Design a protein around this ligand. Structure first.
Ligand code: MG
Ligand code: MG
Ligand code: MG
Ligand code: MG
Ligand code: MG
Ligand code: MG
Ligand code: MG
Ligand code: MG
Ligand code: MG
Ligand code: MG
Lengths: 155, 153, 177, 40, 71, 148, 108, 94, 38
RNA sequence: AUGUAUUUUUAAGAGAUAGUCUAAAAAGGUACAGCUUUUUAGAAACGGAUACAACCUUGACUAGAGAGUAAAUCUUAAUACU
């Protein structure tokens, strides 16, 4: 097998380190990070949060509008639970496909229960004489994310 | 003024000229503050004040409310106070010089370490903004900074 | 991360000047990426109603490579609008007359068909050889990877690699070459 | 996409179906009071 | 064909349904076999007792699980 | 219709709910007739429910006037300076109740197309994308063809 | 000492996986730009507007520039400046100016 | 300048459209699923006489529920409280 | 409509064509060519 | 049998009874029609066949700044006789 434009697969060859070296390297990296967390040196967290059928990018102090009614008294403080991603400037924590509750916590507040503005759904036919007009209103709920809190523990 | 307006303080206030010319509104608001200070501890009014005022700083910048016009000089002074010597402006990224809309990135270096960097429409305004940045990281007012605490000790 | 507002936004939507070398490249495979970069589709901030598109300078335009016999059978047509004013031209001829055309038509025909094509057609600069106004030289940000790996002629190979490749067949001595 | 691989591992075709994603009760009261159950 | 499918309760697509593996039914399934996907049920933990009724889930490999999500 | 109306981004009144949540509803003014049938539901509501609702919500004032009116009405007013008008006209007690509770939980903000569901200040933690961000720099910061 | 992508730019990037296995982690410190890769700031300022005889005459000589062209030509240069076509640069009609939103909404 | 006579897809002359590699794939995919199907349909649990009347109990009972369903249709009870409750219409303060 | 037998070769309905393209003859393909074998 | 919920009757009713193509079996015609004539099957999407009535995918509601899929993007090759 000499070097012909075919005989050599046209793409860079692959090397992945031995799993033991990587196990060490990993425990190392995780530890270092866990020390950044123990320290509290992360400035501001964001987290990608699954909620109410959607995914959102959440940071503290902010606002999202949920399309369905949630039963909570206005003003209640609420622990969002499903968290896919977490992040901070230096480093980032990723759920498969979720994070342990103990690993992170996000507390948001329900701000406003409301009704959506009128939407207009109109079906129509050509010269079959069929119009149907409907006006729809959707119950909506606005939450303010209060705090993203990250606890030290990771292994 | 804006705040007290939204708290219906303007609504409740006894004064001539209903629009409540702004000074009178300030006075009245802070009056409700001091009255709280007498009716409840300083510790309570602390909570209040941090709720209805500090918040209004949310999203806002440093040099938004500081207004200081020579970032460069202040930078060198605060550096002097840090026992750090000489901010050195050195150009990093540039797209177009013949453009009507060129872009510059001027980096600021202390002892060949990069302290901060900034974008701009001219090399001048770039130096300016990289300086803004440097100042921000120095003082700790930075987007990345821990968002403010709200808690009940 | 922490920037003031005016500069921050100026940075995000900043136009860029890209350079792309054409010597020995298919006008098609060139115009593909040329068009990408023109529409602004390399920028994750991209949006259609947003003006983003980046300048593109292609150089060494005369040195286009055409796969197949395409030089011979691809014809470019156009019409004056006058009766019998219709014009069919072999690609070879056209390029002979005006080096720039071939590539320009590729890129043109490759953009969406709305108005902004006309406008992004402006940010496209095309040079037969490498001769560029030091104006346009001055503002060049970055070089793009050549979209095809050009085959070397026989004469490029080092004698090391000539010897390195094994002799496949042993010729008879008697035979004359 | 990615239905295939998901299937071969034995998950749902769709990440919405029957995964822990959908199953868990995504909010609680901060007090710890378990939230009223979900219609889905 | 339509009505085979109607009397199989196969009305709504991409939805699993269960049926006897007896031949009486295989008549029907044989009629529509190109419209459908059949796969054998499997019961690894075995059959649900009454206690396990609210906990029973069905995995796409064609398997039934009795205990779903312990604590 | 979208292009018909105004819009507003999603927002808080006075950054409500951040430090402490403050019910944004200020006062309610019911106007009904002791006599007219049109007000029937709203009479019963005034009897039974109003009392307790008031206890539910200290922050709101409730002004209830029987007057010779033929169309029962309730007018919400908000700290936002905003005012909203309503008819309680010919509704049940259940109905009224639900509606007053609607008014209770509103921003006072206007009902208009809300451009996007998320209001975020400084979404950009750890950076905000700019063209150069993923480009490697060269030695001397030279151009593509520039020489030294 | 392995990352899939060069640490040339942005962040040096560390992927890792928890010994549990239910969590991926990432350590990404910013990679700052080397002083070697930098070039000096351009400095150009030159004033010849000063005439040796009278310097008020000379400092009134930098306020002495201004000019007037026609609509067509001006538009051509304008559009050769910012690399747009000649179209963007024409006025809009009365009806079209009427309907520009008087008070447009602002985020942030 | 090359035209199609008449209607595109209809007559004795048609727009030619060719099979796609994609198409070959889709078809094979379906064939696969159906090969598997007619496998799983091969080997029944019970035999034929084995399944004789094996729920004759349930099948008549469902039908007795179905019968019983229409058994029950009669006009609805009418109560005092309706006829009289219509007078709450005029309910007064005085 | 065209009769089941014609002179002119009769366009097939698409799905039948699909069926063809699937059922094409495939010749056994050798591991190593017999001629280039010893 | 079995899988399903239909079917028959009784009291009232109207419209409709001027059809198109698509696969199939047949006749007529020129083994011609976007042709005509019957029988059995299908359809008449806001998705795909660029465009499209009939072909293929799918049957349906209301809202989401969620996800999974379906049909489908377009290919296939032709040299001496010393
Ligand atoms: Mg159905
Ligand atoms: Mg036609
Ligand atoms: Mg035809
Ligand atoms: Mg026919
Ligand atoms: Mg007729
Ligand atoms: Mg008739
Ligand atoms: Mg016909
Ligand atoms: Mg029929
Ligand atoms: Mg279409
Ligand atoms: Mg549906």
């Amino acid at each position: 097998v000499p070097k012909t434009s075919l005989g050599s697969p046209p793409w860079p060859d692959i090397v992945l380190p031995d799993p033991v070296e990587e196990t060490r390297h990993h425990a190392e990296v995780v530890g270092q990070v866990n020390e950044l967390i123990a320290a509290g040196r992360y400035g501001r967290l964001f987290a990608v949060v699954h909620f109410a059928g959607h995914q959102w990018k959440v940071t503290a102090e902010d606002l999202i509008l949920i399309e369905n009614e949630l039963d909570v008294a206005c003003g209640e403080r609420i622990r969002l639970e499903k968290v896919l991603l977490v992040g901070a400037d230096n480093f980032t924590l990723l759920g498969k496909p979720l994070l342990g509750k103990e690993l992170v916590r996000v507390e948001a507040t329900v701000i406003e229960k409301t009704e959506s503005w009128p939407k207009i759904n109109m079906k129509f036919q050509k010269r079959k004489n069929y119009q149907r007009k409907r006006i729809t209103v959707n119950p909506q709920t606005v939450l303010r994310i209060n705090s993203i809190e990250i606890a030290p523990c990771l292994c | 003024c804006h705040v007290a307006r939204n708290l219906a303080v303007e609504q409740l206030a006894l004064s001539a000229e209903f629009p409540v010319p702004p000074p009178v509104l300030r006075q009245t608001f802070f009056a409700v503050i001091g009255a709280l200070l007498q009716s409840s501890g300083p510790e309570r009014t602390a909570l209040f004040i941090r709720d209805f005022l500090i918040t209004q700083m949310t999203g806002k910048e440093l040099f938004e409310m500081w207004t200081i016009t020579n970032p460069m000089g202040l930078l060198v002074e605060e550096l002097k106070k840090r026992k750090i010597s000489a901010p050195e402006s050195r150009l990093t990224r540039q797209s177009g010089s013949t453009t009507a809309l060129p872009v510059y990135f001027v980096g600021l270096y202390c002892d060949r370490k990069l302290i901060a960097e900034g974008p701009g429409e001219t090399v001048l305004v770039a130096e300016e903004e990289a300086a803004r940045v440097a100042l921000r990281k120095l003082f700790g007012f930075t987007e990345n900074r821990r968002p403010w605490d709200y808690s009940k000790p | 991360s922490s920037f003031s507002k005016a500069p921050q936004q100026w940075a995000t939507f900043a136009r860029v000047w890209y350079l792309l070398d054409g010597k020995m490249q298919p006008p098609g495979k060139l115009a593909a990426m040329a068009s990408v970069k023109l529409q602004g589709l390399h920028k994750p901030v991209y949006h259609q109603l947003s003006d983003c598109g980046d300048h593109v300078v292609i150089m060494n335009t005369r040195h286009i490579a055409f796969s197949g016999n395409k030089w011979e059978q691809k014809v470019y047509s156009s019409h004056t609008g006058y009766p019998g004013g219709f014009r069919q031209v072999t690609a070879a001829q056209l390029h002979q007359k005006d080096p720039v055309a071939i590539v320009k038509l590729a890129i043109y025909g490759m953009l969406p068909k709305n108005l902004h094509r006309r406008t992004m057609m402006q940010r496209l600069h095309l040079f037969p050889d490498e001769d560029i106004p030091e104006d346009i030289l001055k503002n060049l940000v970055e070089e793009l990877p050549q979209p095809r790996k050009v085959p070397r002629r026989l004469d490029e190979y080092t004698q090391e690699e000539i010897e390195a490749f094994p002799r496949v067949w042993s010729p008879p001595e008697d035979y004359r070459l | 996409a990615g239905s295939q691989w998901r299937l071969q591992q034995g998950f749902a075709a769709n990440p919405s179906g029957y995964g822990p994603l959908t199953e868990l009760p995504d909010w609680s009261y901060a007090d710890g009071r378990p939230a009223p159950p979900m219609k889905g | 064909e339509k009505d085979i499918i109607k009397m199989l309760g196969l009305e709504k697509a991409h939805t699993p349904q269960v049926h006897k593996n007896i031949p009486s039914v295989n008549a029907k399934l044989k009629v529509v076999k190109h419209l459908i996907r059949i796969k054998p049920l499997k019961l690894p933990q075995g059959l649900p007792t009454e206690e396990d009724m609210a906990n029973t889930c069905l995995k796409s490999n064609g398997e039934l699980v009795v205990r779903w999500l312990l604590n | 219709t979208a292009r018909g109306t105004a819009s507003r981004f999603l927002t808080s009144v006075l950054h409500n709910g951040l430090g402490r949540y403050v019910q944004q509803l200020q006062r309610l003014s019911f106007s009904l007739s002791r006599d007219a049938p049109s007000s029937r539901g709203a009479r019963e509501f005034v009897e039974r429910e109003v009392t307790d609702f008031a206890r539910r919500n200290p922050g709101v004032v409730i002004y209830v006037n029987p007057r010779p009116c033929c169309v029962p009405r309730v007018v919400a007013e908000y700290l936002n300076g905003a005012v909203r008008e309503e008819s309680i006209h010919c509704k049940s007690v259940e109905e009224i109740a639900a509606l007053v509770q609607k008014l209770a939980d509103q921003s006072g903000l206007d009902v208009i197309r809300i451009r996007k569901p998320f209001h975020t200040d400084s979404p950009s933690i750890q950076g905000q994308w700019h063209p150069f961000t993923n480009k490697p720099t060269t030695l001397g910061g030279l151009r593509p063809r520039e020489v030294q | 000492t392995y990352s899939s992508l060069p640490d040339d730019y942005n962040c040096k990037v560390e992927l890792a996986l928890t010994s549990d296995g239910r969590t991926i982690v990432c350590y990404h410190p910013s990679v700052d730009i080397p002083y070697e890769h930098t070039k000096p700031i351009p400095x150009x300022x030159x004033x010849x507007x000063x005439x040796x005889x009278x310097x008020x005459x000379x400092x009134x000589x930098x306020x002495x520039x201004x000019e007037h062209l026609e609509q067509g030509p001006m538009i051509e240069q304008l559009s050769k400046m910012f690399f747009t076509t000649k179209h963007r640069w024409y006025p809009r009609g009365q009806y079209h100016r009427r309907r520009r939103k008087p008070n447009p909404p602002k985020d942030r | 300048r090359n035209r199609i006579p008449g209607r595109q897809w209809i007559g004795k002359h048609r727009r030619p459209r060719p099979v796609s590699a994609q198409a070959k794939q889709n078809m094979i995919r379906r064939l696969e699923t159906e090969a598997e199907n007619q496998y799983w349909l091969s080997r029944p649990f019970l035999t034929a006489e084995q399944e004789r009347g094996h729920a004759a109990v349930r099948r008549a009972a469902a039908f007795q529920a179905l019968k019983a369903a229409q058994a029950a249709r009669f006009p609805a009870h009418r109560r005092l409280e309706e006829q009289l409750g219509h007078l709450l219409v005029t309910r007064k303060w005085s | 409509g065209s009769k089941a037998v014609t002179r002119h070769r009769r366009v097939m309905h698409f799905e039948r064509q699909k069926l063809m393209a699937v059922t094409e003859y495939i010749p056994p393909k050798p591991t190593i060519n017999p001629r280039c074998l010893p």
